[PDB]
Design a binder for this molecule. Structure first.
Ligand SMILES: Nc1ncnc2c1ncn2[C@@H]1O[C@H](CO)[C@@H](O)[C@H]1O
Length: 298
């Protein structure tokens, strides 16, 4: 992985945008893909930590542009883009800064019922438009067919762990993957554009108006199961819980809440395997060891 100096961030922008004067530059945060710089308190520029990170950023840019102005909550607008090299699909992208603070579970529970209800409706209306976006232009690099993902993960687990597990333990991996595969409820969705990292850290809130003012981080958006954007909100400790998320489901007019719960339980167990794969794909060796240890003693 790579980090950046303030000097580098500014030379990279100066090369392609020589008339853009940078007065203030600060780290605003960090994901798995990119380090984020706040520029002139007006822009957030993402710089890729690695090539995989690049690819997501290139994806994020193309998605931001395709969905510009079609959705009922503010989203970053792409203003500045970098260049491809032998290492990055995109050296950086600068987007408009959306002001506000993450809508943490804590922050949401403290609001009056009226603003809570309103945040539940604003989220439903947001997803409902997001999931309605025409997919016809999105190529396979943005399509994430879940059956293929589960089959592809299975092969990665096996390539990665074949020398790391015993007999009975790989058998349990097999049994788990065979049961997932058997269950038709995971694969029979109408594919569509999903945020795919749809959690409280990516929901920005205006505490002066008590209203959600932005959705951010589109680096994982893909064409996949719209239930993914409800289940990423349901996680009980880190996220909103089922009361609040059921309000989103009902404002969204979701027809099959029980299926949503079922997908959530599956994804809860699946996390261990995700941790191994993400482990080696994004560099995180702590994730890898935790997931391994969990499969070892599940
Ligand atoms: N367009 C944006 N406006 C405000 N913050 C952003 C924007 N894009 C990314 N970020 C911030 O930097 C972090 C890591 O990517 C985000 O979770 C968020 O705080």
């Amino acid at each position: 992985m790579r980090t950046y100096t303030f000097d580098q961030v500014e030379k990279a922008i100066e090369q392609l945008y020589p008339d853009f004067t940078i007065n203030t530059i600060e780290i605003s945060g960090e994901g798995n893909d990119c380090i984020a710089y706040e520029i002139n308190r007006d822009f957030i520029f993402k710089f890729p930590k690695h090539s995989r990170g690049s690819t997501n950023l290139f994806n994020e840019v193309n998605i931001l542009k395709r969905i510009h102005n079609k959705l009922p909550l503010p989203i970053p607008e792409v203003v500045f883009t970098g260049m491809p090299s032998e290492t990055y699909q995109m050296s950086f992208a600068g987007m408009t800064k959306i002001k506000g603070v993450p809508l943490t579970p804590l922050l949401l529970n403290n609001l009056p019922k009226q603003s809570q209800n309103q945040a539940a409706k604003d989220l439903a209306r947001f997803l409902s438009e997001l999931h309605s976006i025409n997919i016809s232009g999105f190529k396979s690099n943005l399509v994430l067919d879940f059956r293929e993902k589960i089959n592809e993960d299975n092969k990665k687990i096996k390539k990665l762990l074949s020398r790391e597990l015993k007999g009975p333990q790989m058998k349990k991996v097999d049994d788990f993957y065979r049961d997932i595969l058997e269950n038709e409820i995971y694969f029979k969705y109408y594919p569509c554009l999903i945020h795919n990292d749809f959690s409280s850290d990516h929901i920005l809130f205006d505490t002066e108006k008590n209203t959600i003012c932005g959705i951010i981080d589109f680096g994982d958006a893909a064409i996949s199961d719209p239930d993914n954007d409800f289940i990423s909100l349901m996680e009980d400790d880190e996220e909103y819980g089922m009361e609040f998320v059921s309000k989103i489901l009902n404002h969204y007019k979701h027809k099959d809440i029980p299926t949503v719960l079922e997908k959530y339980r599956m994804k809860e167990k699946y996390w261990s395997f995700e941790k191994i794969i993400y482990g080696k794909e994004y560099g995180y060796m702590d994730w890898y060891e935790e997931g391994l240890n969990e499969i070892r003693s599940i």
